[PDB]
Structure 1
Amino acid sequence: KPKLRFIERAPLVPKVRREPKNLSDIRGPSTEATEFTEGNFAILALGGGYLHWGHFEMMRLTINRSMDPKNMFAIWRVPAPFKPITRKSVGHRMGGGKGAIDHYVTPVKAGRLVVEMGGRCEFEEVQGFLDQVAHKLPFAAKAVSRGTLEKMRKDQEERERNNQNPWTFERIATANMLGIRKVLSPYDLTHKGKYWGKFYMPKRV
């Protein structure tokens, strides 16, 4: 059906063992689905972050409002929020054990498409309302097409060839040049210098 289905709060199988909040689930590029499938238009996440259910009800009710379902469709690329988040009730001293299970979230890494769209319309049509839903998200977003996304990678693959600065990040970081692996994380070899925690730096080679 050419509309985004109702994604629920609190998936109907409740997990009893609550998970530690590993923030390595946000770091760096997404190894998961980072290229289109049966859809030309999407909102690529240019930064990591957490998508609540309250984030989903914003995009599900704004895309469906501003789309003719006759000429367009829209598919998610993110699952239901599976990771539980623990909140202690405010007004307790620290400790006593890990608190109650409160609300569920899903981790979106950088470079991961969120909701893919397509149909008998162009990128300049969907740019009106996808840029609405872009800025409302808890990370740097940018609505890109297929022809708009792979422009950005030839930019980022010419800029690894074009720069005349003889010191790049990756030549210094993989070699431990000044003793620089002391300050750099062991992920800094692996991502590139282009990332910094949750935040992705696009202006950087």
Structure 2
Amino acid sequence: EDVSIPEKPKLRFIERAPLVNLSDIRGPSTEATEFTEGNFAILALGGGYLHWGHFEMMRLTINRSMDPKNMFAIWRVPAPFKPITRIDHYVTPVKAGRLVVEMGGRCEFEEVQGFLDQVAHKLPFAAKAVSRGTLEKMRKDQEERERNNQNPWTFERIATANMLGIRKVLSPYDLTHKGKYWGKFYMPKRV
């Protein structure tokens, strides 16, 4: 009851074109990594561009499934700005680890997961519905794997020291990525 729904619960429409770069979809996301006024969200586990077609799909599905009084949804992705020439169409690049959509209100993750997970599978890149507790457990679990890892050899140690001259077969960005990120694809199991 404490939570208050905004005057406009359902997701707002997204413009097809702005009113008025492969690196964009590569690597960890530096923005929109933390929940803002919403417990649940869809977490991007890959890097892919989002054209307007996807936005209409997500907005239509989320809005009908969600109940306006019970819950509200806020867009985290900006409008399509990147020009794709085949301008044939406009897209929105999303980096790995970014929350595409956020869901907050009087609801539980199990209630929210259903529609959010369904929309997630449509996204052109791997995405999984997450919650405050789940996402924190996901990050906490990842940190536990690193500290308790028994392997004395790690990608970061080998890459930073250039052991075996590994940097000849590696990208410069791999020093920061540390082997967790291979191009647009992100490997969670990698420590």
Q: What is the CA deviation profile of residues 78-112 of structure 1, one whole-angstrom value per residue up to 9, with x for unaligned ones?
A: 100011111xxxxxxxxxxxxxx111001000000
In structure 1, C-alpha distance between the alignment counterparts of 2:180 and 2:81, rounded to whole Å: 28
Deviation at 1:153, TM superposition (A): 0.8
SS at match of 2:30: coil
SS at match of 2:166: coil
Structure 1 segments (4+ residues) deviating >3 Å: none
Secondary structure in structure 2 of the residue aligned to 1:65: helix
With normalisation by structure 1, the TM-score equals 0.87
Q: Deviations over 1:153-178 (max 9, x none)?
A: 11110111111110011110100000
Tell me how far 1:33 sits from its aligned partner. 1.3
Q: What do residues 10-41 of structure 1 show as CA deviations (whole Å, max 9, x unaligned)?
A: 122xxxxxxxxx11111110011100100001
Q: Distance in 2 between the 1:70 and 1:33 partners?
A: 25
Distance 1:6 1:155 in 2: 37
Stretches of structure 2 that go unaligned for 5 or more consecutive residues are: 1-7
C-alpha distance in structure 2 between counterparts of 1:117 and 1:77, whole Å: 10
Kindly report the root-mean-square deviation, in angstroms, between the aligned alpha carbons of the 2 structures.
0.7
Larger Rg: 1
Count of residue pairs brought into register by the alignment: 182
User: How far apart are the structure 1 equivalents of 2:107 and 2:17?
Assistant: 35
CA distance in 2, matches of 1:188, 1:62: 37
Structure 1 gaps, min length 5? 13-21, 87-100
Equivalent in the alignment of 1:172 = 158
Q: How many Å separate the matches in 2 of 1:173 and 1:155?
A: 24
TM-superposed CA distance for 1:133, in Å, is 0.3
Task: Write out per-residue CA displacement over residues 174-204 of structure 1, whole angstroms, 9 at most, x where no aligned residue.
Answer: 0000000001100000112101000000111
